């Protein structure tokens, strides 16, 4: 019986792999259902019982994953958001938590959830050179938005966000001004990125990347940096409040920004931002997803 059942199970496992593989090919051109940012890394092992052997996706902490379908309770179908990465099998939180426990027992070693749902396209948010609401920063950011609207026409959505999305004590600030409106704007930003178009936000209340680091918006922070305090004073002529936060932005650790635009010429800064966003467009629109 032990031999006969192993033969029947091998034929059943072989057929399940063929259909699982066929389901994977269908998912190459399917729309992205949602995206997650990972808090863990995953190195697939032969014993993980992947629906198709060797076609589980490897990823690292803080990676972004585009999810296409639910295969079963243990497995999703999706891809790492990176050029050259194709759709594969991604473990669900149910599966990841069991693999994590097995590892801890093997090595004799309440975890934070491994995935956070984030927008399918990370929203672009500009910070710098100084405070928003003033002419110098507003003019330079409007110049960058106008360039993006032309360079990425038909591929980008630019929208204004007047709600304080940093509130996504803070109790007093939320009492100043409505979590309903903030949550509504958050969901609106998620919706704008659903079809994988680039999303750029004119967020009035976001002047520093620490104000939106703890959110699930996972934004692309673009730092328009005027390195010379004298040039800023020249352009301004409330200088005191403006010069202080430009100093504050310069003090920020560099890894808190995704792009630092410190080029001495504005046209070179626009090309730098355009090159970065074209690479992000490629990473989110692989050639295999278009047929």
């Amino acid at each position, epitope marked *: 019986s032990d031999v006969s059942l192993e033969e029947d199970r091998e034929a059943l496992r072989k057929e399940a792999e063929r259909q699982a593989l066929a389901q994977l090919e269908k998912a190459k051109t399917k729309p992205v259902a949602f995206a997650v940012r990972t808090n863990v*890394g*995953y*190195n697939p*092992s032969p014993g993980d019982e992947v629906p198709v052997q060797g076609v589980a996706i490897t990823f690292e*902490p803080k990676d972004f994953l585009h999810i296409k379908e639910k295969y079963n309770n243990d497995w999703w179908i999706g891809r790492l958001v990176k050029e050259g990465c194709e759709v594969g099998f991604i473990p669900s939180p149910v599966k990841l938590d069991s*693999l994590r426990l*097995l*590892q801890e027992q093997t090595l004799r070693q309440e975890h*934070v959830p491994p995935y956070d749902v984030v927008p399918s396209m990370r929203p672009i948010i500009l910070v710098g050179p100084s405070l928003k609401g003033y002419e110098v920063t507003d003019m330079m950011q409007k110049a960058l938005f106008d360039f993006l609207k032309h360079r990425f026409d038909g591929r980008i959505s630019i929208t204004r966000v007047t709600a304080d999305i940093s509130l996504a004590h803070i109790i007093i600030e939320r009492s100043n001004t409505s979590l309903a409106e903030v949550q509504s704007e958050i969901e609106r930003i998620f919706e704008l990125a659903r079809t994988l178009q680039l999303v750029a936000l004119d967020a009035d209340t976001i002047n520093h990347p620490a104000q939106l680091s703890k959110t699930s918006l996972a934004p692309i922070i673009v730092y328009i940096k005027i390195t010379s305090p004298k040039v800023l004073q020249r352009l301004i002529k409330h200088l005191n409040v403006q010069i202080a936060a430009s100093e504050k932005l310069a003090q920020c*650790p560099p890894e808190m920004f995704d792009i630092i635009l410190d080029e001495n010429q504005l046209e070179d800064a626009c090309e730098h931002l355009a090159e970065y966003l074209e690479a992000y467009w490629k990473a989110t629109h692989p050639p295999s997803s278009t047929p």
Partner: nanobody, 128 residues
Framework: GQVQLQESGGGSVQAGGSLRLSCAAS????????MGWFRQAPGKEREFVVA????????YYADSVKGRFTISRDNAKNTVDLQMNSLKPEDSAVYYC??????????????????????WGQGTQVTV
């Protein structure tokens, strides 16, 4: 003893100086393993310095060395290099390279934790 981590590039430098450390791994290809550097000063407990992911896409530095040190990795040659610039006397210690364990599921804290590293070098001295 199949796995061996050979380290090179230590020595003594004047403060504000620079040095390059390197570690060549042998015995395994270590293609999905992290690789990092720890250091230990006399009378001080061992402490994390820097680590690089198996892919080379992600690096992790201790705050005490951020901006001054940089790590790189050549997997074809199975080597890691640590460029240390603007060296300070508090950087004086024996530096050990290490290969991460065969992690199945891991978070960022694995990179900073010595007991998550499986193989170690013998150490190289670095003074001021």
């Amino acid at each position: 003893g199949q796995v061996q981590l050979q380290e090179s590039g230590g020595g003594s430098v004047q403060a504000g100086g620079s040095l390059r450390l390197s570690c060549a791994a042998s015995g395994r290809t270590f293609s999905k393993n992290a690789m990092g550097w720890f250091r230990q000063a006399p009378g001080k407990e061992r402490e994390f310095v820097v680590a690089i992911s198996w892919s080379g896409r992600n690096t992790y530095y201790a705050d005490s060395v951020k901006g001054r040190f940089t790590i790189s990795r050549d997997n074809a040659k199975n080597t890691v290099d640590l460029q240390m610039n603007s060296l300070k006397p508090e950087d004086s210690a024996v530096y050990y390279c290490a290969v991460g364990g065969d992690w199945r599921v891991y978070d960022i804290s694995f990179y900073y934790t010595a007991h998550q590293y499986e193989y170690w070098g013998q150490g190289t001295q670095v003074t001021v």
